[PDB]
Amino acid sequence: ADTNAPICLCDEPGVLGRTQIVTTEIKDKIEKAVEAVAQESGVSGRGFSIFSHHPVFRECGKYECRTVRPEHSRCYNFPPFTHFKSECPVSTRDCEPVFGYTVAGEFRVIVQAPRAGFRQCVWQHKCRFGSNSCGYNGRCTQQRSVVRLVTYNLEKDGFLCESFRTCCGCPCRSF
Amino acid sequence: ADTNAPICLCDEPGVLGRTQIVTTEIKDKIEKAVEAVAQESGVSGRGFSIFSHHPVFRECGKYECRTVRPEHSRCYNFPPFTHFKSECPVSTRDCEPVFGYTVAGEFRVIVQAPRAGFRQCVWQHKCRFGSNSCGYNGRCTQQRSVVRLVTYNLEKDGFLCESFRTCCGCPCRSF
């Protein structure tokens, strides 16, 4: 594999920040579209409920930044739901990405519309010091899982659920 | 009177995982307060922090463990930023304090929330062998400096910056 990389949400070498800067015009388009969704609802204007009528949001739009805690994205909370015997120290950061590369490696725009009231978050848990030695013979390794998040299709002006790899833990594996 | 063994951030058997009064009851309260900031903040970027949108954190949240280097707490990194002519031998230890005494002598809980992505580190540089003769007429002296760290005010259960003395070096104080 020449160019190979799993790529976790918010992954970035320079202190894990932003790679490129999405056009404000795009953010504008998204805000508008999300507002359109909220209005086609109207009823139940108390919270996320304004989005709960649209099929895609119902399917994968529930990683609400307001409710998602870090433990919800630890590997033990994703199938197979098992705990690590030994896990290395973990660096945890909330992630609210505007872009992501799917499981298939494609580039996608992940929907974030703070003004409209729709924000998606998934806390990332990575090996604190990369892959250092840890067992009596082990190695610190990044484990991942997969989350589905609402993305925005620029062409067809439509929403869609897509799969992204998320960093859930750092088990000390025997290499 | 003088003392060969100076007192620094992380000194005395009180600073530990459990620690003095820093009950798992307090710890948890702090963790959730930090998570709330992460959840409402969201704002992030390279060479930044997700906490830089909150006023207390933008002011004194820069001793985050992932960015801190041992030399960042050496005396020459604090005003008047001057180097020593002769410095006695130093013992450098990492320090991630859970409580401390402010420059005004008050006890304060120093925020440490590993699970929400906020840890504070200030490496202590102590006189390896204190007070012993070093120069012609000098005596090895613990040099302290002042650092501001995010604290948790019990009363108003919120965040506040406070000033703490930190051990930055051990100059041979001759004359």
Interface membership of B17 toward A (CB under 8 Å)? no
Q: Between A and B, how many CB-CB pairs are < 8 A?
A: 49
B158 sits in which H/E element:
strand B158-169
**Minimal C-alpha gap between A125 and chain B (Å):** 9
For this entry, resolution in Å reads 2.0
Q: H helices within chain A, ranges in order?
A: 24-39, 55-60
Contact A12 B46 (CB under 8 A): yes
Q: Tell me the C-alpha distance between A35 and A3, whole Å.
A: 39
Which residue of B lies nearest to A16 if distances are taken between CA atoms?
Answer: B46
For residue B67, what are the CA distances in angstroms to B28, B46, B49, B61, B120?
A: 24, 12, 10, 11, 10
Q: What angle do CA B31, B33, B34 make, to 5 degrees?
A: 65
Interface membership of A69 toward B (CB under 8 Å)? yes
CB atoms within 10 A of CB B85: 10
Q: What is the CA radius of gyration of chain A?
A: 18
Contact B45 A18 (CB under 8 A): yes
CB atoms within 10 A of CB A59: 13
Contact A93 B46 (CB under 8 A): no
Which residue of B lies nearest to A92 if distances are taken between CA atoms?
Answer: B117
Which residue of A lies nearest to B44 if distances are taken between CA atoms?
Answer: A17
Token digits for B86? 């002769």
Structural domains in chain B plus CATH codes:
1-175 (2.10.90.10)
Environment class of A160 (CB within 10 Å of its CB; exposed 0-12, middle 13-18, buried 19+)? middle
- Elucidation method: X-ray
Which residues make Cβ contacts (< 8 Å) with residue B128, sequence separation at least 6? B88, B89, B90, B91, B170
- Choose among A15, A17, A70: nearest Cβ to B116: A70
Q: What is the 3-state secondary structure (H, E, C) of A31-77?
A: HHHHHHHHHCCCCCCCCHHHCCCCHHHHHHCCCECCCCCHHHHCHHH
Mutate to test the interface with B, among A9, A66, A67, A94 (most CBs of B within 10 A): A94
